[PDB]
Amino acid sequence: GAVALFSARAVDIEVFTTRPDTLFGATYLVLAPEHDLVDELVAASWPAGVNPLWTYGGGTPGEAIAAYRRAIAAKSDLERQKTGVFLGSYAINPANGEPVPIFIADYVLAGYGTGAIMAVPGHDQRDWDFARAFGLPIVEVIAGGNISESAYTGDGILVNSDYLNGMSVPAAKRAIVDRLESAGRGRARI
C-alpha cells in the first residue's frame, strides 16, 4: 500500500491506496461522510455550472451534506450490503497538479485506512460505477483492458502517467512512492 497527501486547493487530505501506481488517473477524492475534514472543506456556495447530480438537491453544500448524513442514517444493513455529495471544493492531485473535486460517499468507511480514498475510475470498479453515475472523468493509466466497458484491475503498462510511462505496475508502484517520498507527500505502507 501507500499513503499520500492531496492538498486542498483553497489543509491536507491523506488517502490510503493499494494502487499508488494509478495516481495520474485519480480524478476525484472521496471522504467518509463522518470524516473530520468534511466540515472544514465544505464550500459556502455551489460553483457556477455544478452538475445537479452532485448536489443532493441541496441549496448549498452545507445543507446537502447535512441532508446526506441524515438520509444515510435511515439505511439498514440491507442497503449497506453509489450515492454521494460534492463538497463544493477541490484538492490538487500531487502527480499532475490538477484540481480534482472532493466528495463524501457512504461507500467510503470512516474507521478504515485514513477514511479517505483517491478515486481511480479507470482501475477500480467501485470508482468506475460512481464516476458513471455522477459524470466524473474516467482516465486510463494502465493499458491492458477497455475502460469504456469496465474498470481494468489487472497488470499492464503505464500510460498517460508522465515519468511512469512504459513501466509495469510493480515498477510504477516503486517509482511513484520514490517520487512521493522525495516530495515529502507520501509513504509506502503495509
Return the residue of 35, 65, 101, 127 that touches ligand A2H, per CB under 6 A.
127
> Least CB distance from residue 172 to ligand A2H, whole Å?
12
Q: Is 120 in the site for ligand A2H (CB under 6 A)?
A: yes
Nearer residue to ligand A2H within complex by CB, 63 or 129 = 129
C-alpha cell at 61: 453544500
For the stretch 56-68, what's the b/e string if a residue is b when 16 or more beta carbons lie within 10 angstroms of its beta carbon? bebeebbebbbeb
Please state, in angstroms and as integers, the Cα–Cα distance from residue 18 to each residue in 59, 63, 97, 123, 124, following that order: 36, 33, 21, 11, 11
> Least CB distance from residue 84 to ligand A2H, whole Å?
12
Q: Is 144 in the site for ligand A2H (CB under 6 A)?
A: no
10-39 positions binding ligand A2H, by CB under 6 A? 16-19, 22
Nearer residue to ligand A2H within complex by CB, 46 or 107 = 107
> Least CB distance from residue 77 to ligand A2H, whole Å?
17
Q: Give the binding site for ligand A2H (CB under 6 A).
A: 16-19, 22, 108-109, 112-113, 115, 117-120, 123-124, 127
